[PDB]
Amino acid sequence: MKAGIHPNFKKATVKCACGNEFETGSVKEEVRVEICSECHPFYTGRQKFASADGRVDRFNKKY
């Protein structure tokens, strides 16, 4: 580190909207996260609990 030419680096915790924690550093001090890796559905393993999904080819005129 040539001092002065780098911005300040310090501990900066994470608050996701779901309330998950992460012991993080950043140039800022605090980050609000709308969606984390435990609730965004692709990193929920595979669509664990975030889904409104499905697709069929339905051919139904029986009413």
Partner 1 sequence: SLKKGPFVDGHLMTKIEKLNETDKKQVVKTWSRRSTIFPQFIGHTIAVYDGRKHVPVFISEDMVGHKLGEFAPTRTYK
Partner 2 sequence: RIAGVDIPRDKRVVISLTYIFGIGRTTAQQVLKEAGVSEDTRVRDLTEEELGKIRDIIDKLKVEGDLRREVSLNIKRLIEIGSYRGIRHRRGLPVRGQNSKNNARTRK
Partner 3 sequence: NRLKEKYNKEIAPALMTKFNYDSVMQVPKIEKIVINMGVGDAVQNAKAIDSAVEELTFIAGQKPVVTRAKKSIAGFRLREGMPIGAKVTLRGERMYDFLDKLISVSLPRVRDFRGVSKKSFDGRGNYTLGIKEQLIFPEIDYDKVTKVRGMDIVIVTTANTDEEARELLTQVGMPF
Question: Which residues would be at the binding site for partner 3 (CB under 8 A)?
Answer: 1, 5-7, 9, 14, 22-28, 30-37, 40, 42-43
Greatest Cα pair distance, the chain, in angstroms, is 76
- C-alpha span between 27 and 16 (Å, rounded): 18
The separation between CA 48 and the C-alpha centre of its own chain, rounded to angstroms, equals 14
Our finding on whether 30 is near partner 1 (CB under 8 A) is: no
Residue closer to partner 1, measured from CB, 34 or 57: 57
Stretch that binds partner 2, among 5-13, 21-29, 51-59 (CB under 8 A): 51-59
Residue with tokens 């911005």: 7
Member of 11, 19, 23, 34 binding partner 2 (CB under 8 A): 34
